[PDB]
Design a binder for this molecule. Structure first.
Ligand SMILES: CNCc1ccc(Oc2ccccn2)cc1
Length: 209
């Protein structure tokens, strides 16, 4: 059972701007997704301060970066609070309509695309480098779900049959053909050190055979 939804108009415009504006500094997508993962980890940590059972679904709080050159995918995994089906609809737990409006105003006042994360819609910077994005997520209060979109105005949500995650979020970036530099170990390391060296969770960069 696959459900197909239309993006709200303003989110569709945000995605079209990210895809179609000439902007060479694409590497910021990874900073934004790691920052989102840190935010999600902070949330489950905070809930666990008063209810330890919130970590029955997994005590480890971490971020994994998994490149796969055969699949041409970069996957960012975190064991944060995850998202309910309702959160996945409703723009992956963001205030994306008002955030996009504020981001648009800033761009017209001289800001650039790299400020996107200050407006709460940093997730959509994934489309700087990905032709399709798959989000697998498990929240303590819901079942495991998969969100997917190749932009073009729509996304899908289905129950995830795949590997159980326990708790957290997996962002799978299906990279554009000309953006495979983001599968190279030395490139990922360089970006993580430049933008995320002080993240307060362990970031493990997986290697390949
Ligand atoms: C914005 N809150 C999350 C967060 C925390 C630490 C962090 O680390 C670095 C590393 C290099 C330069 C700047 N910040 C990056 C993001």
């Amino acid at each position: 059972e696959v459900e197909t939804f239309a993006f709200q108009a303003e989110i569709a415009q945000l995605m079209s701007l990210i895809i179609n504006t000439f902007y060479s500094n694409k590497e910021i997508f990874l900073r934004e997704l790691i920052s989102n993962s840190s935010d999600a980890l902070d949330k489950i940590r905070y809930e666990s301060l008063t209810d330890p059972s919130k970590l029955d679904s997994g005590k480890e709080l971490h971020i994994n970066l998994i490149p796969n050159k055969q699949d041409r995918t970069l996957t960012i995994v975190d064991t944060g609070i995850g998202m309910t089906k309702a959160d996945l609809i409703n723009n992956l737990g963001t205030i994306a309509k008002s955030g996009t409006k504020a981001f648009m105003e800033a761009l017209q006042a001289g800001a650039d695309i790299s400020m996107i994360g200050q407006f709460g819609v940093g997730f959509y910077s994934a489309y700087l480098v990905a032709e399709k994005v798959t989000v697998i997520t498990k929240h303590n209060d819901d079942e495991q779900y998969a969100w997917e979109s190749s932009a073009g105005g729509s996304f899908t949500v289905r129950t995830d049959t795949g590997e159980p995650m326990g708790r957290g979020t997996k962002v799978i970036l299906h990279l554009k053909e000309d953006q495979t530099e983001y599968l190279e170990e030395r490139r990922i390391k360089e970006i993580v050190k430049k933008h995320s060296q002080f993240i307060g969770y362990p970031i493990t960069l997986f290697v390949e055979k």
